[PDB]
Design an enzyme around this catalytic site. Structure first.
Site, PDB file in Angstrom:
ATOM      1  N   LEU A   1      -6.488 -14.384  -5.332  1.00  9.50           N
ATOM      2  CA  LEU A   1      -5.413 -13.507  -5.783  1.00  9.50           C
ATOM      3  C   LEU A   1      -4.170 -13.570  -4.910  1.00  9.50           C
ATOM      4  O   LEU A   1      -3.055 -13.595  -5.436  1.00  9.50           O
ATOM      5  CB  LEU A   1      -5.909 -12.057  -5.850  1.00  9.50           C
ATOM      6  CG  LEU A   1      -6.387 -11.535  -7.208  1.00  9.50           C
ATOM      7  CD1 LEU A   1      -7.306 -12.533  -7.889  1.00  9.50           C
ATOM      8  CD2 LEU A   1      -7.088 -10.194  -7.044  1.00  9.50           C
ATOM      9  N   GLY A   2      -4.355 -13.535  -3.596  1.00  2.82           N
ATOM     10  CA  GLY A   2      -3.200 -13.526  -2.687  1.00  2.82           C
ATOM     11  C   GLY A   2      -3.580 -14.135  -1.363  1.00  2.82           C
ATOM     12  O   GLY A   2      -4.787 -14.204  -1.081  1.00  2.82           O
ATOM     13  N   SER A   3      -2.590 -14.582  -0.594  1.00  2.00           N
ATOM     14  CA  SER A   3      -2.870 -15.231   0.710  1.00  2.00           C
ATOM     15  C   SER A   3      -1.818 -14.812   1.740  1.00  2.00           C
ATOM     16  O   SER A   3      -0.786 -14.236   1.337  1.00  2.00           O
ATOM     17  CB  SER A   3      -2.929 -16.724   0.581  1.00  2.00           C
ATOM     18  OG  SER A   3      -3.349 -17.316   1.803  1.00  2.00           O
TER      19      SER A   3
ATOM     20  N   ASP B   1       3.249   4.883   3.941  1.00  2.00           N
ATOM     21  CA  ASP B   1       3.646   3.619   3.333  1.00  2.00           C
ATOM     22  C   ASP B   1       3.557   3.710   1.814  1.00  2.00           C
ATOM     23  O   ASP B   1       3.056   2.797   1.151  1.00  2.00           O
ATOM     24  CB  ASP B   1       2.794   2.458   3.853  1.00  2.00           C
ATOM     25  CG  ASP B   1       3.384   1.105   3.509  1.00  2.00           C
ATOM     26  OD1 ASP B   1       4.559   1.062   3.091  1.00  2.00           O
ATOM     27  OD2 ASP B   1       2.675   0.085   3.647  1.00  2.00           O
TER      28      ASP B   1
ATOM     29  N   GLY C   1      -4.856 -13.349   6.393  1.00  2.00           N
ATOM     30  CA  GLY C   1      -5.813 -12.774   5.425  1.00  2.00           C
ATOM     31  C   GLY C   1      -5.548 -13.211   3.994  1.00  2.00           C
ATOM     32  O   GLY C   1      -4.394 -13.574   3.690  1.00  2.00           O
ATOM     33  N   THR C   2      -6.573 -13.161   3.137  1.00  2.00           N
ATOM     34  CA  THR C   2      -6.437 -13.591   1.732  1.00  2.00           C
ATOM     35  C   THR C   2      -7.231 -12.659   0.845  1.00  2.00           C
ATOM     36  O   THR C   2      -8.387 -12.360   1.198  1.00  2.00           O
ATOM     37  CB  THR C   2      -6.943 -15.023   1.611  1.00  2.00           C
ATOM     38  OG1 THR C   2      -7.536 -15.096   0.318  1.00  2.00           O
ATOM     39  CG2 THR C   2      -7.956 -15.375   2.685  1.00  2.00           C
TER      40      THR C   2
HETATM   41  C1  LIG Z   1      -1.029 -10.812  -3.205  1.00  2.00           C
HETATM   42  C2  LIG Z   1      -1.215 -10.253  -4.381  1.00  2.00           C
HETATM   43  C3  LIG Z   1      -2.471  -9.380  -4.638  1.00  2.00           C
HETATM   44  O1  LIG Z   1      -3.262  -9.211  -3.749  1.00  2.00           O
HETATM   45  N1  LIG Z   1      -2.675  -8.752  -6.005  1.00  2.00           N
HETATM   46  C4  LIG Z   1      -3.849  -7.895  -6.338  1.00  2.00           C
HETATM   47  C5  LIG Z   1      -4.401  -7.006  -5.354  1.00  2.00           C
HETATM   48  C6  LIG Z   1      -5.523  -6.181  -5.671  1.00  2.00           C
HETATM   49  C7  LIG Z   1      -6.075  -5.327  -4.748  1.00  2.00           C
HETATM   50  N2  LIG Z   1      -5.488  -5.270  -3.399  1.00  2.00           N
HETATM   51  C8  LIG Z   1      -6.142  -4.529  -2.299  1.00  2.00           C
HETATM   52  C9  LIG Z   1      -5.410  -3.519  -1.596  1.00  2.00           C
HETATM   53  C10 LIG Z   1      -6.019  -2.809  -0.548  1.00  2.00           C
HETATM   54  C11 LIG Z   1      -7.328  -3.087  -0.193  1.00  2.00           C
HETATM   55  F1  LIG Z   1      -7.920  -2.390   0.833  1.00  2.00           F
HETATM   56  C12 LIG Z   1      -8.045  -4.066  -0.869  1.00  2.00           C
HETATM   57 CL1  LIG Z   1      -9.820  -4.432  -0.377  1.00  2.00          CL
HETATM   58  C13 LIG Z   1      -7.422  -4.801  -1.949  1.00  2.00           C
HETATM   59  N3  LIG Z   1      -7.145  -4.551  -5.083  1.00  2.00           N
HETATM   60  C14 LIG Z   1      -7.671  -4.617  -6.332  1.00  2.00           C
HETATM   61  N4  LIG Z   1      -7.149  -5.450  -7.254  1.00  2.00           N
HETATM   62  C15 LIG Z   1      -6.092  -6.227  -6.954  1.00  2.00           C
HETATM   63  C16 LIG Z   1      -5.527  -7.134  -7.977  1.00  2.00           C
HETATM   64  C17 LIG Z   1      -4.438  -7.939  -7.675  1.00  2.00           C
HETATM   65  O2  LIG Z   1      -3.906  -8.800  -8.653  1.00  2.00           O
HETATM   66  C18 LIG Z   1      -4.444  -8.612 -10.012  1.00  2.00           C
HETATM   67  C19 LIG Z   1      -4.010  -9.804 -10.864  1.00  2.00           C
HETATM   68  C20 LIG Z   1      -2.651  -9.542 -11.620  1.00  2.00           C
HETATM   69  N5  LIG Z   1      -1.759 -10.398 -11.241  1.00  2.00           N
HETATM   70  C21 LIG Z   1      -1.863 -11.568 -11.960  1.00  2.00           C
HETATM   71  C22 LIG Z   1      -1.277 -11.459 -13.356  1.00  2.00           C
HETATM   72  O3  LIG Z   1       0.001 -10.938 -13.342  1.00  2.00           O
HETATM   73  C23 LIG Z   1       0.070  -9.742 -12.675  1.00  2.00           C
HETATM   74  C24 LIG Z   1      -0.506  -9.831 -11.270  1.00  2.00           C
END
Ligand SMILES: C=CC(=O)Nc1cc2c(Nc3ccc(F)c(Cl)c3)ncnc2cc1OCCCN1CCOCC1
Length: 277
Positions: free
Chosen positions: A22-24, A133, A25-26
């Site tokens: 999903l994103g990149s 934040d 820690g990663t």
């Molecule tokens: C760098 C980007 C990035 O990480 N995104 C995302 C972060 C998520 C997340 N974060 C997190 C925060 C704090 C924590 F403690 C933890 Cl453990 C996790 N938690 C749950 N679900 C997540 C879903 C994500 O993307 C969804 C796919 C949609 N996308 C693609 C299609 O178009 C729209 C966007």
């Protein structure tokens, strides 16, 4: 002085199966299968002692909250690297979601988001928790009608363009300084993802705020909605509205959303993490 009797579940790495990145820690995505006969969509977020000391602090906060509008930790994995397993929010963060869907977001969805975020922050205040934040980037989306607050790397008890003045000047972070960040967050949504104080460098933010200047009125906002946002930005933090009041006000406006926002155009055994208790 209340005992945080929350539970920290330690999860075997054989329990979950990663799928994609999903994103990149990663940050990764996968399915957590607890012997439980159930599959749970999760987001699975090297030697630096401070990197672990901060990551585990996030897991401490996420494990201690439980609310429909706050992202909760499902557990952590202690392998070669420390992983945080949380509920999968399929639609990403609300900032990206509001930018990619500018021309299909209606007044009912916008005002509903304001109510849900105010509910989430009102819960955090019950837990004696200051987020420090709050921003549109840190609100995630599971369904277009259900958002939650996340990213507690700052939460206790730098994002200059979201902080209250007392925070920028005196390092003071209160539940009312979260109300300030809330007003900036609502401004992000009502502008469909505009960068607050775009251009203005962070060196001059606390100076223009002392001159009295605030963010401009977003075009879709009636003066009723913008008045509320302006109230979150008063220098006297006690004059700023309460999260319990922001729930009430935005909820009254969600009953008739077109009166306050003028917008042109108004696997098998899978369970969701919110049904796994
Ligand atoms: C760098 C980007 C990035 O990480 N995104 C995302 C972060 C998520 C997340 N974060 C997190 C925060 C704090 C924590 F403690 C933890 Cl453990 C996790 N938690 C749950 N679900 C997540 C879903 C994500 O993307 C969804 C796919 C949609 N996308 C693609 C299609 O178009 C729209 C966007």
């Amino acid at each position: 002085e209340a005992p945080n009797q929350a539970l920290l579940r330690i999860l075997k790495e054989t329990e979950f199966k990663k799928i994609k990145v999903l994103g990149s820690g990663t940050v990764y995505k996968g399915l957590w299968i607890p012997g439980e006969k159930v599959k749970i969509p999760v987001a699975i977020k090297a030697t630096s002692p401070k990197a672990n000391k901060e990551i585990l602090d996030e897991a401490y906060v996420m494990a201690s909250v439980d609310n429909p509008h706050v992202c909760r930790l499902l557990g952590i994995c202690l392998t070669s690297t420390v992983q945080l397993i949380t509920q999968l929010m399929p639609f990403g963060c609300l900032l990206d979601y509001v930018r990619e869907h500018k021309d299909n977001i209606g007044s009912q969805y916008l005002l509903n988001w304001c109510v849900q975020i105010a509910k989430g922050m009102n819960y955090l205040e019950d837990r004696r928790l200051v987020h420090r934040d709050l921003a549109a980037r840190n609100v995630l989306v599971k369904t277009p009608q259900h958002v939650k607050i996340t990213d507690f790397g700052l939460a206790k008890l730098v994002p200059i363009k979201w902080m209250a003045l007392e925070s920028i000047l005196h390092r003071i972070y209160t539940h009312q300084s979260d109300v300030w960040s809330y007003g900036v967050t609502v401004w992000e949504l009502m502008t469909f993802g505009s960068k607050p104080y775009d251009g203005i460098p962070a060196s001059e933010i606390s100076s223009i705020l002392e001159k009295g200047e605030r963010l401009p009125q977003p075009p879709i906002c009636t003066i009723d909605v913008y008045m509320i946002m302006v109230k979150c930005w008063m220098i006297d933090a006690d004059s700023r509205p309460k999260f319990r009041e922001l729930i009430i006000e935005f909820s009254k406006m969600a009953r008739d959303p077109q009166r306050y926002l003028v917008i042109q155009g108004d696997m098998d055994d899978v369970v969701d993490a919110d049904e796994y208790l």
